[PDB]
Amino acid sequence: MVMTVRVIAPDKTVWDAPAEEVILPSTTGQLGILSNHAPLLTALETGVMRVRQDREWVAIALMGGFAEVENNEVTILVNGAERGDTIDPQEAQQTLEIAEANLRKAEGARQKIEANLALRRARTRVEASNTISS
């Protein structure tokens, strides 16, 4: 009746929310994953995708990974991602501070990238590990 997309990481699982239409840039440039969309595998690079639940929109920021849909079942195997809704103020200031220091003397922009995905996988790992402990 609808689409079902779920994000997953090599360190743990993210979540599995519903959907209706997925539009985002891919290898060929344009990619459209729907619920009725037959079972096919695809690849995606570091970027963000726009999810269409039904009436509202939901965009997620995930690094380099792989995407594959099948029978209303999408699998995003990214090596570290993050949701725009799960963003904190301390984080932005943290990544900005460490970044400035990295480029200062440490490695160049390459350092910020490595640390970017690192924290991404760490955050999801924490929320996935201690999601709910009674």
Q: Which whole-number Å values give the CA distances from 91 to 83, 99, 120, in the listed order?
A: 13, 12, 11
Residue 7: how many other CB atoms lie within 10 Å: 22
Sign of the Cα pseudo-torsion (35, 24, 54, 120, in order): positive
| One-letter amino acid for residue 2 of the chain | V
Give the 3-state secondary structure of 56-76. CEEEEEECCEEEEECCCCEEE
Beta-carbon-side half-sphere exposure of residue 77 (alpha carbons within 13 Å):
7
β partners of residue 91: none
For residue 106, the Cα-to-chain-centroid distance in whole angstroms is 27
Exp. method: NMR
Domains of the chain: 1-88 (2.60.15.10), 89-134 (6.10.140.480)
CB within 8 Å of 35: residues ≥ 6 apart: 1, 2, 3, 4, 19, 20, 72
Are the C-beta atoms of 44 and 24 separated by less than 8 Å?
A: yes
Residue 112: phi and psi, rounded to 5, are: -60, -35
